Amino acid sequence: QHNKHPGKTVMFTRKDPLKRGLFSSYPYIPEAGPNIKTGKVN
């Protein structure tokens, strides 16, 4: 029998692990009188 390393794999990763490629995202927050009178007269 061949001997073995006594350590088993636990840590796992993946490619492109971030959400939508962004580290973090901000939440959405919603949102007188009469004038002077004159004219031609006589």
Partner: protein, 430 residues
């Protein structure tokens, strides 16, 4: 920023021979010593490991010490043996006998003066000296005794530099030497006071690496020593080539050691690919990271799942984005948060270098500081106590002149190191 190498004993001389073959290949140095390389990037840092002799030649900054010249005759007869300076070979006339007391006290005091004169001549020649690098086994006789003697003398001479050791440690399943527990315990006692950073390798882990990962049909010690030479030449790569995030041996020490006694690390090298499967997996930073954390790729018997990481370091070689490195290190820290010590906010340091090793698109070397190393010392202390209570082979050491009190000091110091690791593993914020 120059490194000085010391090779001691049979294991040290053989690993050194393979290391200098790998380094001469990466910088394009002919075995005659003539530069025949093809890029200025190779020449501009050649001084880091080679001194220049007249009319083109380069000589390697290494001291070879052994008590019987048989191994040295084998390395001088080897294909690159001519490069070594004849005056750099120091030898006695009788072997160490695998006995620590003989190697440290009788032939040690006889030869040590010539080794210190060669080491001082080699160190002073540097324009600015970086730390020393030593390769030896702890289970042997001249490796353990002369390595720890020379380390103590160099620490007296050059206390402000770095002291780095690569060390072979006894396998948990089969011994290569019967008196291994005494030599290992006394050597670890010497190292914890004198050393700044120490890497430990089990031959059993390299055998399992070769058979399971590389599926080699008939491996030889040249392959194991090539894997070791690859990681050894990789840790220093950022010292001697340009990159987007430079790093240095002192920066690794400053980021890896939280407290001065906790300086023992695990080592790994990632791009090992099986002899018939390269078509099944493309090179990528996630693939290197996945192999990087797989315990199958670690060169020690202890497993991370029984401990916690205080700190870790990854050095990347190749043309790659910094975003992928940072997000991979964040994703691994976030997804496996229970295996990282919580009172440190980030345990991994990253570094990026532009020039990969020849024939590989990318490579990374991994250094890890994990509390599971306490399990190895506890096993060695158990075997030491079993042998010492019955005086199993003690008359050799006592007949050479050792006081029994030295054995109790080394046992107490190793037991306190195990206790300190156990206390830091179970510490809490409160």
């Amino acid at each position: 920023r120059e490194i000085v190498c010391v090779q001691a004993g049979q294991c040290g001389n053989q690993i050194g021979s393979k290391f200098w073959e790998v380094i001469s290949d990466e910088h394009g140095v002919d075995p005659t010593g003539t530069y025949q390389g093809d890029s200025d990037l190779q020449l501009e840092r050649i001084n880091v490991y080679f001194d220049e002799a007249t009319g083109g030649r380069y000589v390697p900054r290494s001291v070879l010490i052994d008590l019987e010249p048989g191994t040295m005759d084998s390395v001088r007869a080897g294909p690159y043996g001519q490069i070594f300076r004849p005056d750099n070979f120091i030898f006695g006339q009788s072997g160490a006998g695998n006995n620590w007391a003989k190697g440290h006290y009788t032939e040690g005091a006889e030869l040590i003066d010539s080794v210190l004169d060669v080491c001082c001549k080699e160190a002073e020649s540097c324009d600015c000296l970086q730390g020393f690098q030593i390769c030896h086994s702890l289970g042997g006789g001249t490796g353990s005794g002369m390595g720890t003697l020379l380390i103590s003398k160099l620490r007296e001479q050059y206390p402000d530099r770095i002291m780095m050791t690569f060390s072979i440690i006894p396998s948990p399943k089969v011994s290569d030497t019967v008196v291994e527990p005494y030599n290992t315990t006394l050597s670890v006692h010497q190292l914890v006071e004198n050393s700044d950073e120490s890497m430990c390798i089990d031959n059993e882990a390299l055998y399992d690496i070769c058979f399971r990962t590389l599926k080699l049909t008939t491996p030889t010690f040249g392959d194991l020593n090539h894997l070791v030479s690859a990681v050894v030449s990789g840790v220093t790569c950022c010292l001697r080539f340009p990159g987007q995030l430079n790093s240095d041996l002192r920066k690794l020490a400053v980021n890896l050691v939280p407290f001065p006694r906790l300086h023992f690390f695990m080592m790994g090298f990632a791009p090992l690919t099986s002899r018939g499967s390269q078509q099944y997996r493309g090179l990528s930073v996630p693939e290197l990271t996945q192999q990087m954390f797989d315990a199958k790729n670690m060169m020690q018997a202890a497993d991370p799942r029984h401990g916690r990481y205080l700190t870790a370091s990854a050095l990347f070689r190749g043309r790659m984005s910094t975003k992928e490195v940072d997000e991979q290190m964040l994703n691994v820290q976030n997804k496996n948060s229970s295996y990282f010590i919580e009172w440190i906010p980030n345990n991994i340091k990253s570094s990026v270098c532009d020039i990969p090793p020849k024939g590989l698109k990318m490579a990374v070397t991994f250094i890890g500081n994990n509390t599971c190393i306490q399990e190895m010392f506890r096993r060695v202390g158990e075997q030491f106590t079993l042998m010492f209570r019955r005086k199993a082979f003690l008359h050799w050491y006592t007949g050479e002149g050792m006081d029994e009190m030295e054995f109790t000091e080394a046992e107490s110091n190793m037991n306190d190191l195990v206790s300190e690791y156990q206390q830091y593993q179970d510490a809490t914020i409160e």
